[PDB]
Amino acid sequence: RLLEASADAN
Amino acid sequence: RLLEASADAN
Amino acid sequence: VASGSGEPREEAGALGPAWDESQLRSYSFPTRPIPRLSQSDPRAEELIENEEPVVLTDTNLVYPALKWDLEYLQENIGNGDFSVYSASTHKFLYYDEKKMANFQNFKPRSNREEMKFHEFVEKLQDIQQRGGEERLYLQQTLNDTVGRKIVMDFLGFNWNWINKQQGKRGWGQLTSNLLLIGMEGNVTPAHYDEQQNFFAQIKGYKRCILFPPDQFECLYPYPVHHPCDRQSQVDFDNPDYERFPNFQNVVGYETVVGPGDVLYIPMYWWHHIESLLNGGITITVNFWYKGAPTPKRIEYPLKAHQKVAIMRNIEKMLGEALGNPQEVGPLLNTMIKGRYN
Amino acid sequence: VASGSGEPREEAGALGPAWDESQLRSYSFPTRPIPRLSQSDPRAEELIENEEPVVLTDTNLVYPALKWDLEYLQENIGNGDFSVYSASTHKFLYYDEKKMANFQNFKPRSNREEMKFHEFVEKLQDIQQRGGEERLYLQQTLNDTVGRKIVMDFLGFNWNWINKQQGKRGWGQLTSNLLLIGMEGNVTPAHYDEQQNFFAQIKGYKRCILFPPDQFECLYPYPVHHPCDRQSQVDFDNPDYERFPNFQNVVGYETVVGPGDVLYIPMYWWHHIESLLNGGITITVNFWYKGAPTPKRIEYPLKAHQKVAIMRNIEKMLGEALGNPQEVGPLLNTMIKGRYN
Ligand SMILES: O=C(O)CCC(=O)C(=O)O
Ligand SMILES: O=C(O)CCC(=O)C(=O)O
Ligand SMILES: [Fe+2]
Ligand SMILES: [Fe+2]
To answer: Where is this region: Interaction with VHL (chains C, D)?
Structure first.
């Protein structure tokens, strides 16, 4: 929930 | 959501 | 315009002033007076709607109980058990026992106990004569176990008026009525409640000091998972300005209520309540209503009480997510140190 | 045991050391070496599984590209547009343009631009001779627009190995392959990515300094809504210990990668990457994979990267709830001042 990650990179 | 209140009293 | 409760009201029949300054405790902050109005006055309805405090002098809310005193209560209040807090200081800091697990280094300053009304009245008379310093405060929700005389008084309350108030403000349901009987000088330290409250004074006088939701920064509530959740950490009698700097910017709204007065304490408003010194015992019955629901559409920016709702929620969520409320602080700090402060 | 990348490797055929200390920039922190292992070595598989960095020397991951150089690329890479960052300093701080709205006082230190490969190679040759100080870094996801020669090299990558890696770690899908070509001395300041990365060096050498997720407190990332979200606020060349005290406790894992090496950069691990000074241009192709999904059952206490996931989420939520990311800090502070710090 709050543990969920996204997926961003440079 | 985060705006939701509960209902506590002394 | 920071007088306080203003000039002590004069009792009808030239019975002298109801109380005098010397009965009020001394504090480091200024305060302005809460308005005293007739419930038929539009200004009062405007204050209730905009969620601001107001003392209503003629609601007849608890007309039938004005005759209540210990003797009469001992007589018809019933056989049930009454919660009674005891303390060696005038300050009755409230603590949620369910939360006492999360904090073991917490030592209660007042211990609760059950007893029959007659027993409370007795422990009370006992101290009174033996010249004791122990303090007592009976705080008990009114329920089925009460006598018929008491139930008749109860039915006699001005339900027509309050019910219309609940209707007008879209409030939720009346959750309870707390009967509070305390010794003069007793103090209930500043805290806020998550419900709308019509505070009905019955016997004795109580000085009420309220702070709006937007003074959250100056009052420093305990962490949500601490037993004193919602209570202010600042000792009003000896404020620690090093730990609580902004308490030097606090400003309260004050008033003294008496038999017949009804103080509207809006949801989230901080309130510090004290029974006048040498004013004898006090009696009050409050009416707690769940507040209205969150509007369909949120308007920006947010009101102070909404930001308070959010902070409590963030604290609650972090507590569950981390699997331990003791970790909330370290996480919060890690999150802001060198990033937001 | 805080040497760094260790003793400079010796090239086959007595071709001398690949590079020397004097090509490495100087920093205030100690570092220990990242292990260099054979992909057939169990210790390497143990590191990938436990999510720790490891340099694999013989994967043959991008065997076909080892022959790549500007000339060859200009030739067959295609006609597409290539993103190319320019800067007057060696530091290429990455900034999310979508987030440039939220912060107007932010002045980019490097500006992106599109161009054809031949144009990049040209602007590059142009500076090189005219003795310029301007810096360039081409960073472009590999797509359809590439030449068939390049597509053939691409198909030649060791998919059998990497695909099995993705399978073994339960990782998600390969999201992209970033082609990076930069001038010697160029620096990509410390930051972390939300994906698993197999970093394949092709031409030139790159010194890679990694910090584990648990050093979040010493690296001070920018606020989530800031353009430099995920980048460290600390200038490694002139660290401000007053604002960032804990940067004095930072310890990195370091290594120097060359043609043929593949550096596993685990998701959330900070990494600072630099092309050796006077090492000539560098070429690398990375492989970004979405990480595995959150386990069915959470085990406590939480791992460092999970706490980082939570902090980012709290910051994102507060940003939407308050209707403005600029309010996040004041709320966060109000929430902790005199309550959790
Ligand atoms: O009257 C008191 O002493 C406490 C009352 C109170 O906290 C309330 O009614 O919300
Ligand atoms: O090699 C570089 O300069 C940057 C690489 C990077 O940040 C990455 O692959 O995650
Ligand atoms: Fe209260
Ligand atoms: Fe990266």
So the answer is: 1-117
